[PDB]
Every structure is written in C-alpha cells, then in structure tokens.
Amino acid sequence: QVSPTRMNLLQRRGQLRLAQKGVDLLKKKRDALVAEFFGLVREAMEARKALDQA
Amino acid sequence: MAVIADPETAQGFRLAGLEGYGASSAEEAQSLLETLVERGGYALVAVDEALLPDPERAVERLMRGRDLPVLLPIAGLKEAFQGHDVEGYMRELVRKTIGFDIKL
Amino acid sequence: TVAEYLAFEHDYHVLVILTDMTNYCEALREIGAAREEIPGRRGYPGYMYTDLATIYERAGVVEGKKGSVTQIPILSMPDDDRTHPIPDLTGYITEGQIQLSRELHRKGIYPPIDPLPSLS
Numbered sequence: 548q549v550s551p552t553r554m555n556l557l558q559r560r561g562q563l564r565l566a567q568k569g570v571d572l573l574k575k576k577r578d579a580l581v582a583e584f585f586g587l588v589r590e591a592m593e594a595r596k597a598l599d600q601a
Numbered sequence: 602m603a604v605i606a607d608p609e610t611a612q613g614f615r616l617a618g619l620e621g622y623g624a625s626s627a628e629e630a631q632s633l634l635e636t637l638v639e640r641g642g643y644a645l646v647a648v649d650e651a652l653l654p655d656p657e658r659a660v661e662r663l664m665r666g667r668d669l670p671v672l673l674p675i676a677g678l679k680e681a682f683q684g685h686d687v688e689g690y691m692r693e694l695v696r697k698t699i700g701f702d703i704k705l
Numbered sequence: 706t707v708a709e710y711l712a713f714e715h716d717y718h719v720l721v722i723l724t725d726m727t728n729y730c731e732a733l734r735e736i737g738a739a740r741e742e743i744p745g746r747r748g749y750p751g752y753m754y755t756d757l758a759t760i761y762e763r764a765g766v767v768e769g770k771k772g773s774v775t776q777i778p779i780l781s782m783p784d785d786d787r788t789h790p791i792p793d794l795t796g797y798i799t800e801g802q803i804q805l806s807r808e809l810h811r812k813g814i815y816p817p818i819d820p821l822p823s824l825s
C-alpha cells in the first residue's frame with residue numbers, strides 16, 4: 548500500500564522507534580501519576596478521620 | 602451549598618448559616634438536587650450515605666460538563682456513632698478507581 | 706506532428722489531450738523487454754525518460770508565431786502513488802501536475818482535485 552522504497556523503510560523504522568520510546572515515556576508518566584495518587588489517598592483517609600470527629 | 606440527611610440536621614445547617622435540606626428518599630433528594638443544580642446554591646452538595654452514596658446520576662442528568670456541583674457522601678447523625686467504613690471504603694475506592702485491589 | 710503543423714503553420718491554439726499515458730509506457734516496456742535493454746526502476750527500460758521527453762517537450766509557444774500547444778496527458782498512477790516510474794518521470798519532464806485524490810472522491814466531490822499535492 549505505502550510506497551515501497553528504502554527511504555520509506557527508514558521512515559517506518561523511525562516511527563517504530565518513536566512509538567517504542569513513547570511506551571517507555573508514558574509508562575514513566577503513569578508511574579509519576581501513581582506516586583501522587585498514593586500520596587493523596589492517605590490524605591483522603593486523614594481528611595475523612597478529621598471530618599468524622601468534627 | 603446543600604446538604605441532605607434530615608431537615609432536622611438541615612435546620613442545624615441553617616444554624617450554621619448555609620442552606621440544607623432533607624428528603625428521606627432517593628428520588629426526592631435527586632429532584633431537589635436537580636433544581637439545586639438548575640438554580641445554584643453555589644454548587645457544592647453532600648448527601649447522606651444511607652440516602653445516596655453516589656448522586657452522580659444527577660450530574661449526567663443535567664450538567665455533564667465542568668463537574669461544578671461536587672457531590673459528597675456524608676456520615677449521618679444516626680450513623681456517625683460508628684465511624685462508617687473508612688479503611689474498607691478506601692479499599693473500594695482503589696478497587697473502583699485504578700482497577701487493582703491493593704492492601705498497602 | 707499534426708498538432709505542431711496546425712499550431713505553427715496555421716496559427717491555431719491547439720490543445721492536445723493525450724489519454725492514458727501508462728498504456729503507452731507499458732507498450733514501450735514490451736518492446737524494450739523484448740530487446741533485453743537494461744531497466745531503470747521497476748522493469749521499465751532505461752531510455753523511457755527520453756521518450757516521455759520527446760513526447761512532452763513538443764509544446765509551448767514560439768517567437769513571432771501566434772500558435773500554441775497546450776498539453777494535457779491523463780496519467781494513471783498504477784498503485785495510486787507518485788514514486789512509480791511513470792508518474793515520476795512524467796513529473797520530472799513537464800511543468801506542473803494535477804493530482805486527483807480518491808479520498809475526496811469517496812465523499813462525492815467532483816472534480817476530485819486536492820490542491821496540496823498538485824502544482825503548476
């Protein structure tokens with residue numbers, strides 16, 4: 548379908564390598580979001596504790 | 602800033618100087634919540650946990666955008682004697698939120 | 706030949722519609738692969754650029770004479786691409802191209818021209 552030259556093979560290898568970098572970068576983004584999620588869930592516990600006692 | 606457990610607690614909220622209500626049934630509470638989203642009490646509502654845990658059906662009913670009326674479960678005056686669910690409530694929060702079940 | 710005569714010795718404004726220039730090129734690929742003459746890209750014989758040249762280059766206007774030859778070859782891209790040797794060497798002789806897009810045609814748009822890959 549796409550034009551079969553050696554240049555197009557290099558463009559496809561380049562975008563495969565960019566998507567394989569993107570999997571790593573977005574997993575790292577998910578890791579930072581999970582880090583602040585577990586930083587906030589215990590604040591939710593402490594907020595519910597203070598809310599019920601007051 | 603409506604809060605719905607009883608009208609008896611809600612006149613205590615008037616004794617705090619904010620508007621509150623009481624319905625003792627689900628559809629009545631969502632209907633008064635619906636007109637409260639329609640004309641605002643500045644869009645910050647808590648409903649009794651034994652009345653409605655998740656009133657978000659009203660959010661997808663009227664105002665799907667901006668999530669401005671924030672809806673909160675709240676421990677009632679006949680229920681705050683026990684300290685409702687806190688740790689298993691966070692268990693089901695994690696189970697609802699991230700998919701996984703954790704212990705931590 | 707008839708178009709250069711009618712243009713440049715009787716002062717007409719000839720427009721030459723050269724239909725389906727890929728059937729021409731597969732005909733000369735047939736004789737050029739009869740004679741074992743070594744090919745360029747994708748089987749077409751190596752002297753094909755000069756034959757597309759000595760077709761397409763017989764157009765223009767000449768000084769002092771009021772004739773003119775306006776050529777429109779209706780090319781047919783085989784795989785619907787520009788890298789193929791027939792639309793490619795066509796684009797390297799002539800001055801311009803107009804590319805019809807199948808994507809605009811599926812939405813029911815006649816003339817299905819898209820302007821961004823065409824030039825003049």
Ligand SMILES: Nc1ncnc2c1ncn2[C@@H]1O[C@H](COP(=O)(O)OP(=O)(O)O)[C@@H](O)[C@H]1O
Nearest residue numbers: 735736737738739740741742743744750751752
């Ligand atoms: N059976 C054939 N009949 C006619 N031409 C042929 C045949 N086989 C090969 N040829 C062509 O003849 C050419 C041979 O070149 P050559 O004999 O050196 O003469 P010239 O210098 O005139 O091309 C090749 O280019 C080849 O394509």
